[PDB]
Write a structure and sequence with these properties.
monomer, alpha/beta, Double Stranded RNA Binding Domain, five-stranded mixed sheet, about 35% strand, palmitate, lipoprotein
Length: about 140
């Protein structure tokens, strides 16, 4: 197994990111990370959480649901220990004038999958130590 470089963590997230916070916790703990507030634990700071709903007119009309997140690990003294890392997840469906009623069900469904997908990528890069170290 890959040596878990960040054993103990705390999460600093912007407001209105409950769904992501929940998913990050299940996946982080699953990888052996321990949610801690101890003075030796690091801090997973999400600097940017940006959802987006693009309407793309190509051959056909397409609704694309994206979530983009920039984050970096910091210690409890404020020192940046890795450079920021920007990840994104997305799902899209074909907009159809007939099935417009279903939009809300379809979108909330695709949104839960996007958040989940992104929670797993964030967790992957931490557990797999794939974040570039900080540099002056």
């Amino acid at each position: 197994a890959t040596p878990l470089v960040y054993k103990k963590l705390s999460l600093e997230l912007p407001a209105k990111t409950d769904d992501l916070e929940t998913q990050l916790k299940v996946y982080l703990t699953a990888n052996g990370v321990q949610l801690s507030n101890d003075n030796d634990a690091y801090v997973l700071r999400v600097l940017e959480y940006t959802p987006r709903r693009q309407l793309l007119n190509g051959k056909l009309t397409e609704v694309l649901l994206r979530l983009t997140v920039t984050f970096q690990i910091e210690d409890r003294q404020g020192n940046k220990i890795t450079e920021p890392r920007t990840l994104t997840a997305a799902r899209s469906y074909q907009y159809d004038l007939a099935t417009v009623n279903t939009e809300n069900q379809q979108e909330s469904y695709l949104q839960r999958i996007v958040i989940d997908d992104l929670a797993q990528q964030i967790t992957r890069q931490i557990s797999a130590n794939r974040l570039p170290k900080a540099q002056p």
